[model samples]
Target chain A: MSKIERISAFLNDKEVDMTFITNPTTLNYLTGLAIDPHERIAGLMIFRDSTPMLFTPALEVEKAKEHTSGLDIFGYEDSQNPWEVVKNHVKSDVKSIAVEFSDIPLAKTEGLKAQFGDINFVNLTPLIERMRLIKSADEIEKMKVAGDFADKCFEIGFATAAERNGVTESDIVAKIEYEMKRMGVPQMSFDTLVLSGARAANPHGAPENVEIQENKLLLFDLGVMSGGYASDATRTIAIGQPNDFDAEIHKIVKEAQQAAMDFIKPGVTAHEVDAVARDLITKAGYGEYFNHSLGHGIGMDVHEYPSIVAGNDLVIQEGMCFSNEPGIYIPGKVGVRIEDCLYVTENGCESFTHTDHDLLIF
Target chain B: MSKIERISAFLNDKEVDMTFITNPTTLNYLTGLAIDPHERIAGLMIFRDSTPMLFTPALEVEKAKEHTSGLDIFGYEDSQNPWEVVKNHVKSDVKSIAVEFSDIPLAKTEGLKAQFGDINFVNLTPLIERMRLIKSADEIEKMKVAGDFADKCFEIGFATAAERNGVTESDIVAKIEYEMKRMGVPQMSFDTLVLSGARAANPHGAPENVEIQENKLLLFDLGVMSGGYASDATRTIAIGQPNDFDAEIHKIVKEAQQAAMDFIKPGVTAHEVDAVARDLITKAGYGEYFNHSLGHGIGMDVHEYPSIVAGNDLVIQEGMCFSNEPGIYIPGKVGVRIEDCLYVTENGCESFTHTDHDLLIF
Candidate 1:
């Protein structure tokens, strides 16, 4: 069955009168419309018992119609109240409207509530996430293409950092992203991170125009958005031959990641998989430093469902894709993280990114 | 007064029990914390009668502490419910709270509701927007620097497009962005646009690998985010000596933008300013082609409050920064736009961008 048919079936099963999807990714996934309606609303209104209509900014209405042939599409100019436009076109009494709770803000829904008299907003976030959780053959194919681009970026970043006499971390980032754009990638999944030496300790530290330090750890976390899917991966390597302490932390992070990778199967729980990495790192006295979740699901959005963390009991299943990233971040020191986005098979999972995981010496 | 004190004073005057600020830009404006906490919750809790606290993911706790000295900072691991973390740290009756209704999603607010029973949530959007409408002197200085970078990008894009020997629009975009990143720019305010030929007709169309067509109107719209401020500008030029039709549209757009720039002062409404440009395009019979608004307020965020659109009645004042972008887009024919971000002056106004507005032929 088509994706739209599946969503329609879900709406029917739940007895939802209507659904207003405004999340750009979910809208694209449903309608084959590639749009980033920044500060403007682009919504797909599906009903349990009426014709579906697409609403976008007036500037994008024609594009929406071209993408969805023979479908009803409506639009409003900047001056018009967008909710009023939606109210004018939609005929069904939306007593219970399914909405993407995480994507639609309270202010935006206030307009719909005013139009529909405080309509019952049923959260469609979990349903949509589950629907996107398991990858189809083609979805996996697209992910692999995105992964290939990241591997190419790693090749660029690693080479640049290896010869870093005066190359700044942001310079390495620039070279990597520029190459990706030149290779026809539309944009990155997120901002690229290139942290070296002490800067690497901040898990969320962005690249700066400071030189890559010698004999210290360096981290590269980046991804590309291409072909309607996203790929995210992380790599940590030594700028020079690392000292014993830095090498120890890198090795522990690597081993913990490997342990988590080995423990994954269709029957395992997300918590247990995380424990495999957490347990190893904790025993190595870096548990406090490995402060965040092990990984998260990856697909249309870089961070999606089935979070791999300490308490989630979500069961693993075949064809479900997620990341396996383990890190060790010590304050005022250095940090190391290695990540791979993996897709589950019948017996085990395989990584989409196939970069070399060793701490290659510069 | 500090930005935090202003917000606190507003809260006390309004009798709002507390406020939970999650918008990254607002948080940065209040606290010196620069963060883009994607998929992770980063909040600033300011109370009318108590101390303020910061909540971030565990990965960012150290960074937050560094940014905000002498303030309490709380954090949560991915396994813990962030709401539970917030509930634990906050100590108040919490009957009413002002919140960023536009920034906080309904789903996210539900967690607060679940913790505290159905509290009165007040909208703080307008007050915060008004506070940000007028740029401080330092803010305008930062915007000037960002504008300078954008002008530099236009120079690169225009030169690259003029010398088009099989140069694709995306190639020009890549070259411009690559140079910006190399110059230590953190990122662009938004995606760069370089649309040549019929692609320019779609105002929001992104650059592609297709080569720049000869004798076609080309659009260059880009900006840079620098020093905690944003700059947005647009320029249109000819890939070759354009036909009379393209040149005519370009001239009309140039005049329309000039009219808007000249009309902006300390005593007009936003609608009136937009009318100056919009009225001109209408007389030229290309008003329908200009589908979107004339422009919007620009600052810490690229698109912010005080929209420069039709139907708005906001009175202009000195120190208010906004864009005066006027465009004429004819479907399947051509498109032209001339933009200059401006700050209102005592006498009239001054444009942040000083690019030559003439429609120069290659």
Candidate 2:
């Protein structure tokens, strides 16, 4: 109810007539209903004074009613035009309305204008994102469970890779995913990667049919989606004895990851934490090899707001959670990245995933 | 390469200077690179006469180079602003530009407008969708492989459910997915759903931990993603002796499904085919109970262009593929939905999956 009230308060504070939130995550945040009405409208209406109403597909109305914490529920059948349902509920008494620009497509705003005579559309993305930035205790607790599942996934992958010397990269992926979900984890936030040897050198490479060769680095990146919150982590382990080049590169990436993990705290900027890792990797002459950002905020969706990059100036606050991942990708040679999703505390931070940072030789 | 040429011709025909396609599927259709850049920009630049280029995250540059079928690739580091990279590549020698309204958000359009002074943004959704509507020989061949995998998945789900009478909905999903991917499938087009009895009532309901009780209908909805194309199907089977009411609803939905499948041919309108099943169900006194559309076009995306619903006057042509599904849900009682995705032939249609629509009894 407080989450719903916060949006209602935002409506009143901004003097906006109402807010029509269509993004699935935002709807889940406010209504507690995690229904994805594909190609159908699952609009959440927040008026300044009236009760919040979730306008959803008739098929999901029952679930919405059960889970939506007593929000006024209105369902439209499949044949009905969702915009008509909107007009019927929202009378032509509004001057302005708030909408998140992320999920609402360009074509949809055109429909809104044609439906409503003259309504000014204000950006509600930052408002709700700010509200969502600080995690509640319940959300953080859910994330910890998700993180444990991720840790378990890493263990499964490590054991599978270590035991099955001639296993295909994809089978290792198949094994990890099967065991994770078999143990009752509902979903993986993204595709699990089991890149091996030179294959691991591409940061965004897909797992293939090639066998995990000896004396090479292997990377495992996996995430678990549980109870609406998400956990993401990455670990790079050696399949056998590694060469000097691969081992040395792995050391720099491990140290860079820990530097960023240690530097993050309240009152620090997103870029400040990023530069801590960026500078360390750069000083080791592998600056050009580390191609991506330090990290990104993680929550309900695997990737959320506030990218930890060079240009972002957003100050870090307690209760915010994100992934601290730094990598050096030397094409067709070796690539190493170690990630632990962490939540900032008043004093410092704690990573949800407790995997060891030191290089693991499988 | 002809797929790339078709878009270039559309640019020349529409007089739209250049096109910026960001949708992953469309990018795969044109460039043959099936990489989801996640938060990173994977923009495909198509000029009127110049060669096409794919701007991707630096990490994926290697894979993009290998798979993009000779399309020029530009890799950007995480520290670089993607918009700056976009501006540098897309010279100011343009007037009107084309962008897919479906993928480009309103906030992105705001940035595009702010970046380019007075450049008109033209919608290219319908043009690409129309181009994508007809299935080519190679595309349908992949769909057939995907369809076979889905058929195998259905068989796995059926055998698993029958042998393990008290199996939870999720384990059935687990078995189906595990076996399918283990059999070398890369992905499922969407999340698989295995609902039992009243659980199947919700059209968008998720698979849960509820056990599949005897004497009830078990619904299995699954899809297989293979070769960049998708295949989707659904089957509802009996666990034990079903009550007369449950049996009757299944019969009606089955008849409705076949009626629509039997009626489809070239030159038929989309709405006309939808009404074939709708009228049969409505005559059986479940019109209002059958709340959603008959089915939807399935191709690169499971649900794509030309919804098989009433009021759509678009003509169905040969070489077009779609799903033929009809359903009835009596809340808390029993819900029956059987689906088969079919491709339209010159004279009639052929369902990809070879599963018998006649109610399967375990």
Say what the RMSD of model 1 is: 3.0
Which 10 consecutive residues of model 1 chain B have the lowest summed lDDT?
B62-71
Error of model 1, residue A126, in angstroms: 2.0
Instruction: Give the per-residue lDDT digits (tens) of candidate 1, residues A1-362.
Output: 47767778889999998888888899877776788777787778888866788889997888787766456888999769999988988865778888898878888888888788978889998888898999888899999999999999999999998887799998898889989988888589988989998788876688888999998988999999998899999999988888969999888988888898888999999998998889998899877888678998999989987899878888899989899899988878888889999899899888889998878888
Candidate 2 lDDT over residue span B217-258, tens digit each: 999889999989999999998988888898999999999998
Query: Taking the candidates in order, what DockQ does each have?
Result: 0.66, 0.51
Clashing pairs in 1: none
How well is each residue in A1-362 modelled by candidate 2, as lDDT tens digits? 38778888888888998887888888887777788887677788888988777888887788887776887888888567777777788764677778887667766676677778678888888878888889988889999999999899988888888886578788788788888777877578888888888877776578887888888998989999888999999999888789968999889999989888888899999989999999999999988987778998999988997788889998999999998889888888888988889899888999999987677887
Error of 2 at A222 (Å): 1.0
**lDDT per residue (tens digit) for residues B1-362 in model 1:** 66767888888888888888888888877777887778778788887757788888887888788886556888988757898878878875777778898888877788788777778888887778878998888888999999999999989998888777889888899889988998889889988999887788887688888898898888889999997799999999887789998989998999999989888889999999999999999999999999778988899988885689888998999989989998888889998888889999888899889999998877
